[PDB]
Structure formats: structure tokens, C-alpha cells
């Protein structure tokens, strides 16, 4: 799927950051 539950995914809900701060340390060499 519906829309009104899917507009709520525009908000940050992660409640942990052991991936979002990890991937930027390894995305840019992998795409370069």
C-alpha cells in the first residue's frame, strides 16, 4: 504494498548504525 505504509519509510527508523556507517567505508572503493 500500500501507499500510506510506504510513505512512512521516508522517515529514519533504523535504530542501529552498524551498517550505514560501515557501507560508506567500503562502497566507494567497490564502485571505483
Amino acid at each position: 504494498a500500500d501507499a500510506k505504509a510506504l510513505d512512512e519509510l521516508r522517515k529514519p527508523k533504523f535504530s542501529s548504525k552498524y551498517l550505514i556507517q560501515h557501507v560508506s567505508q567500503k562502497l566507494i572503493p567497490a564502485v571505483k
Binding site: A1, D2, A3, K4
Partner: protein, 140 residues
């Protein structure tokens, strides 16, 4: 006795996904019946035609220009019915049983379904008594 026996029935909602070509696609209405009369928030009725896995195909009894994407569709809980009874005698109604002659609401009337199975083999009998049309080319 009405007020002591009064239960505000849980109205089941449903958004409109997509309207046009005389048919709305309706998100929601997970408990709606096939062939149920649904009611849009514009006051225009509809009939739940195709119950799909992800939406409900609703054909719209009326002009579908008053239906928007995001409109709410309340189900009425019953298969498509019209008011039948002796209170319809004398009244000019539209295709859903609502009177168009402006003579007020249909009093002394009772809703019954429009989609009834015809009476079976053992329910008939032979046609005996005549129906005179008053046309003598016909009645002769």
C-alpha cells in the same frame, strides 16, 4: 428499546487506488463480499465485482467523475439490494431503487437482493390462467 440495543458497527474502510473507465480499483476492504454493494464517500454506490488479491474491482452505479484516487469506500455489508414491497407501487425509481419522482422516500418497503436464483424445476407449475393484454391482435 432502540437506545438500549445500540451498537455502532465497525465501518470497514478502503481507499480508491484507480478510477476511470467506469470502474474503480479499491485498496482495502479485506472482508468485502463478491457482489456486495459498497458506498463511496461521494454518496455514489458501487458493486464489488472482482475481488482480487491486491484490490477490489468496483463498478460504479453512477457518474464516476466524483470518485478520486484516495477516496474512502465504505462497505455496506450486503449483496446488491433494492427496496421491494407495496410501497414501491406508484413510484418512479432509478436502477437502484431510489425514487426519482421526488415524492419522498419509499415508505413501507423492505430491501431484497436483485440477484436471486430463479425457481427450480419442482417450484414451477404449468401456465394455466390467461393474462389479457387488451390488444385483440395479441389476445386472439
Amino acid at each position: 428499546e432502540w437506545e438500549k440495543s445500540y451498537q455502532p458497527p465497525v465501518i470497514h474502510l478502503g481507499r480508491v487506488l484507480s478510477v476511470g473507465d467506469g470502474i474503480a480499483r479499491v485498496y482495502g476492504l479485506k472482508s468485502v463480499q463478491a457482489g456486495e454493494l459498497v458506498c463511496f464517500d461521494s454518496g455514489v454506490k458501487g458493486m464489488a465485482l472482482n475481488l482480487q488479491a491486491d484490490h477490489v474491482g468496483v463498478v460504479v452505479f453512477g457518474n464516476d467523475s466524483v470518485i478520486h484516487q484516495g477516496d474512502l469506500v465504505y462497505r455496506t455489508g450486503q449483496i446488491v439490494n433494492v427496496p421491494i414491497g407495496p410501497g414501491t407501487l406508484g413510484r418512479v425509481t432509478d436502477g437502484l431503487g431510489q425514487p426519482i419522482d421526488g415524492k419522498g422516500p419509499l415508505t413501507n418497503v423492505r430491501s431484497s437482493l436483485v440477484e436471486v436464483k430463479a425457481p427450480g424445476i419442482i417450484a414451477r407449475q404449468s401456465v394455466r390462467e390467461p393474462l389479457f393484454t387488451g390488444v385483440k391482435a395479441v389476445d386472439a
